[PDB]
């Protein structure tokens, strides 16, 4: 978008300042209009996590089982204790079997 203005000889410092101002405004707007629920409801929190996981999953080859894998991921993260260490979630890959054959071990 700024390439045409660069071709006209506009000073890059002006473009940098404009980007900084626009980004600050956009981040403030995102923080302002983001929807948050101040209830700390377990059911609502679980549903929010499941929906966020499904949205993060509905672009990959496992998107057909996105509800299944979102439920698994939410369960795993919730049962993680306090630091949410990634090394505390084992990922074992075994050849053969359908995607629905995948399981989460308690």
């Amino acid at each position: 978008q700024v390439k045409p203005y660069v071709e006209e000889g506009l000073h890059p410092q002006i473009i940098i300042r404009a980007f900084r101002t626009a980004t600050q405004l956009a981040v403030n707007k995102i923080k302002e209009i983001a929807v948050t629920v101040k209830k700390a409801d377990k059911v609502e929190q679980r549903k929010l996590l499941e929906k966020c996981a499904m949205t993060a999953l509905s672009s990959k080859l496992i998107s057909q089982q996105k509800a299944f894998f979102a439920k698994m991921v939410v369960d795993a993260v919730m049962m993680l204790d306090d630091l949410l260490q990634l090394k505390m979630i084992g990922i074992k890959k075994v050849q053969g079997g359908a995607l629905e054959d995948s399981q989460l071990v308690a």
Binding site: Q64, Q95, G96, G97
Partner: protein, 77 residues
């Protein structure tokens, strides 16, 4: 034992190995079925259908077929 260089051929080989590991039989039927599915998807693509739509339809039909197999199955002692 087939010396292939194409990556999709390697995917076919891995599919056969997966069928062998999980079941042990039917390692030839999977390859023929996959080839038939891709052959049909070719003529579907030629008519301007997004490949993701083809994959979704295949998944739906596979669910239907698996349910039908469970329905018409028989038990042995």
């Amino acid at each position: 034992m087939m010396d292939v260089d194409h990556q999709i051929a390697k995917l076919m080989v891995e599919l056969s190995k997966s069928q062998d590991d999980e079941i042990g039989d039917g390692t030839t039927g999977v390859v023929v079925l996959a080839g038939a599915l891709l052959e049909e998807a070719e003529q579907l693509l030629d008519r301007g259908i997004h490949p993701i739509r083809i994959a979704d339809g295949y998944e739906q039909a596979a669910r239907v077929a698996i349910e039908h197999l469970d329905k018409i199955s028989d038990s042995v002692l």
